[PDB]
Each structure stands twice: as structure tokens, then as C-alpha cells.
Amino acid sequence: LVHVASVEKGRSYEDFQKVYNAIALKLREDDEYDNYIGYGPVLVRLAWHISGTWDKHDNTGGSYGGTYRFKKEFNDPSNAGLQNGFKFLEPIHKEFPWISSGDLFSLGGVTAVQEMQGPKIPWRCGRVDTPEDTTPDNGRLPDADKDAGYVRTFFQRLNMNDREVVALMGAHALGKTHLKNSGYEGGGANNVFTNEFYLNLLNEDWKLEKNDANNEQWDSKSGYMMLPTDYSLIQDPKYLSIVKEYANDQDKFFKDFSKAFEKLLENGITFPKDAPSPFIFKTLEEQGL
Ligand code: HEM
């Protein structure tokens, strides 16, 4: 199965920068969401979930076809809560109806990371909507109650190695878990992208507790949390080495996250040799906007 990127007709960098700006301006405007966390974290989570259905073995799933717009996928129990990100992107889709759905969902994640002071994430256009029957079945996204070997095996399906897995998981410094969405509750409620996930893993005093949905999670005295899959990154000695690296080098972490997140968003896509190069959007702050 081949999905060839096809640039939205006649569009170039400046068209997509306008879309980025509209997302970024709405991020700034709709500040109250989730007790003033704002929409950044849920848009990162949405970009990852729409990409994380990919299966390298047959090229099913993935961001290309924009299939999250179909009920089977937006109703996946693994996607509970992401409807808030979809609703946030709806007026953007209405203003720019030419951008494909996969391009919009993935650009939402890029814009959120950058506007939250994260790394620049190069982004390529050309995902093309595919029909409802191309929507992947539920059950391709990962469980949180599992250990390091589960995480490692899970991410082989996405063609990610240990460093890429540990880098991507640093997004769990953003936002929070919500009991009604996932059966987990807690988190830093942060909307600034940093390497704090790794520092918190190494430096907090963690206790394994049950939450009010009767699931186990790691809680710290200072009010942070880790899922069992997060904490597994310090139980496995190979992951632990990388956690220590990122806790000790914010620039390294930013560079490695940027590469892994672009790769995640592009898995499954064949780009023509004469496709445009990846775009690097300016933030609102770099534009004086
Ligand atoms: C083993 C892998 C992973 C598991 C099991 C996992 C699980 C979860 C769970 C259970 C939640 C809480 C959902 C809710 O209650 O609202 C969550 C939130 C989140 N996840 Fe992950 N996740 C994983 C990997 C990732 C990756 C790779 C990224 C992106 C790079 C990501 C980004 C996020 C973000 C940003 C949030 C916060 C959302 C918000 O505040 O609304 N996650 N994740």
C-alpha cells in the first residue's frame, strides 16, 4: 500500500504559514480550556493518535488519510477526549477548506509544540483524505498499564527505536490525564514544552498508588504523576540511560523529539523526489504577531 504526498493545488509555504497562524492565534484566544491549560497539549495528543494507528507491515493507518474524521476512529476508546481537539480545529478547517484533514491534524500538533516554546518541527504537506473504509480498527494505540517490554515491542510497529520512544514520551510533560477519558488522573497541567518529564522521573519521590478508577499510577509528593508505561522508562536499564541523557541536555532532547515527532507524523507517506522541502513555520512571537 502506497500513499504518495500530493500538494494541495497551487499552495506553498505562505499558505501553510497562514494556517499555522490561525491555529496559533486560536490557541492564544481559547485560553480557558481545561482549567487554563489551553488546547496545546490535546492538539499534540491528537496529532500523535492520528499517526499512531500506522502499521509498518502493511501501511494501514497513519496520518495520510485523515481517517480520524470517521466515527469508528473518533469513537475509539483510546481517543476519548480528543474530540475537544477536533472541535478546536473545526473553524480552522472552515476557514481553510483546501487543507487536507491529515495535514490539518498533524499541523495542529506541530503548531501546538512550537507555540508552547518547544522545538521547531519541520512539516510536510500533501496528505490526501481517503474514504471511510480505509479507517483502521480500534485497538492500535498503546495501553498505559504495561511495562517496558510492552512499550518497546509496541513501538516497533511504528518503526521507532529506544531513543525515539524515550524522546517521544517527553510529551508527557504536557497537559494532564483525566479520569473520565482514560482512567488516570493527574499530571503537571503544563502548557510550556520542556524536558521536565525526564527530570521528574529521576528526581521525584514516586509512590505506586491506586486512583479513583482502581488503576495503578505513580504519584509524587509534589503532585506529578507517571503512568506505568512512563515509569517503565526508568525500570529498564536501556531506557534509563536515555532518560538521564535528556534530563541533562535540553537541546539534545529538543532535537531528538523534533526528529521523532516529524517521523511519527510522516510514517506511511511517500514523498516525491521533487516534493517541496519540509516547511519550518515561524511562531507568532517570531512574526511579532
Ligand atoms: C506508551 C505510550 C503512551 C501511552 C500509553 C500514553 C497514554 C496516555 C494517557 C492515558 C493519557 C491521558 C489521556 C486523558 O486522560 O486525557 C495521555 C495524555 C497525553 N499524551 Fe500520551 N501516551 C503515550 C505516548 C504519547 C506520545 C508518543 C505522545 C506524543 C508525542 C503523547 C502525548 C500526550 C499528551 C500531550 C497528553 C496530554 C493530553 C491532554 O492534556 O489533554 N503520548 N497519554
Side-chain angles (χ1 to χ4, degrees):
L1 188 53
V2 180
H3 292 317
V4 180
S6 179
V7 174
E8 289 91 334
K9 182 172 187 43
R11 301 288 171 179
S12 62
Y13 177 75
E14 299 174 338
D15 296 279
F16 300 99
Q17 179 77 68
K18 287 175 186 170
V19 183
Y20 176 107
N21 287 355
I23 296 163
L25 282 164
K26 191 181 175 60
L27 268 176
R28 180 187 285 177
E29 181 59 15
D30 297 348
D31 64 321
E32 306 177 346
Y33 173 74
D34 205 5
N35 296 114
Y36 290 86
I37 292 170
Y39 283 94
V42 75
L43 288 183
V44 176
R45 182 193 168 219
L46 179 56
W48 138 238
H49 277 208
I50 65 89
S51 299
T53 60
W54 187 58
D55 186 338
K56 68 185 180 180
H57 296 97
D58 59 8
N59 197 25
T60 54
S63 70
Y64 183 85
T67 58
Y68 175 85
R69 74 190 192 277
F70 296 120
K71 68 185 182 291
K72 180 172 62 175
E73 181 170 348
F74 66 67
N75 289 329
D76 185 345
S78 303
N79 288 336
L82 295 181
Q83 304 93 328
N84 292 298
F86 181 87
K87 298 176 166 98
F88 174 95
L89 292 168
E90 279 181 350
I92 312 294
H93 162 61
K94 180 171 181 262
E95 178 173 6
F96 306 95
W98 55 264
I99 190 169
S100 68
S101 296
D103 281 357
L104 182 56
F105 295 138
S106 63
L107 184 54
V110 166
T111 304
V113 169
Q114 298 195 173
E115 291 296 304
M116 292 192 289
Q117 307 165 51
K120 288 300 166 96
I121 317 292
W123 178 88
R124 297 183 89 165
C125 73
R127 297 167 187 73
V128 178
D129 286 12
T130 59
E132 185 159 24
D133 66 6
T134 67
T135 304
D137 289 344
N138 297 176
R140 292 175 178 225
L141 291 161
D143 298 336
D145 62 350
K146 300 288 194 291
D147 66 3
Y150 170 86
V151 170
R152 179 169 288 122
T153 296
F154 174 86
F155 271 104
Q156 288 173 346
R157 199 197 74 222
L158 296 174
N159 190 39
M160 299 292 182
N161 68 19
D162 286 0
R163 297 181 60 83
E164 291 168 317
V165 169
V166 174
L168 284 169
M169 213 74 67
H172 282 176
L174 297 168
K176 66 185 288 290
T177 68
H178 308 82
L179 204 75
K180 285 189 216 148
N181 289 340
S182 61
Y184 295 97
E185 172 74 34
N190 205 358
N191 58 12
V192 175
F193 192 105
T194 69
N195 71 336
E196 80 170 291
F197 173 79
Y198 308 99
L199 288 161
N200 289 342
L201 276 169
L202 294 173
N203 294 336
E204 291 295 301
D205 179 8
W206 294 107
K207 293 179 67 150
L208 182 56
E209 303 186 317
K210 268 178 168 179
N211 68 28
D212 289 350
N214 200 32
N215 299 314
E216 288 192 316
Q217 58 176 66
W218 294 91
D219 298 321
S220 73
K221 290 187 149 83
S222 307
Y224 297 107
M225 77 164 273
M226 296 287 166
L227 298 167
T229 45
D230 293 325
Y231 196 86
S232 82
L233 306 184
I234 63 169
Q235 297 181 294
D236 177 277
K238 300 185 197 91
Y239 289 152
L240 173 62
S241 290
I242 306 159
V243 169
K244 290 174 179 174
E245 181 182 355
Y246 292 147
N248 287 285
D249 192 333
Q250 305 176 88
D251 183 56
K252 183 53 169 148
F253 166 54
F254 271 31
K255 285 176 175 161
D256 285 357
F257 181 88
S258 175
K259 290 191 303 176
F261 194 65
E262 180 178 9
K263 173 180 167 175
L264 176 75
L265 274 44
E266 292 174 0
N267 274 337
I269 308 173
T270 297
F271 292 94
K273 303 284 186 294
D274 74 332
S277 298
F279 299 136
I280 299 180
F281 299 114
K282 298 176 190 69
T283 62
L284 294 178
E285 175 182 48
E286 286 170 329
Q287 291 172 89
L289 297 171

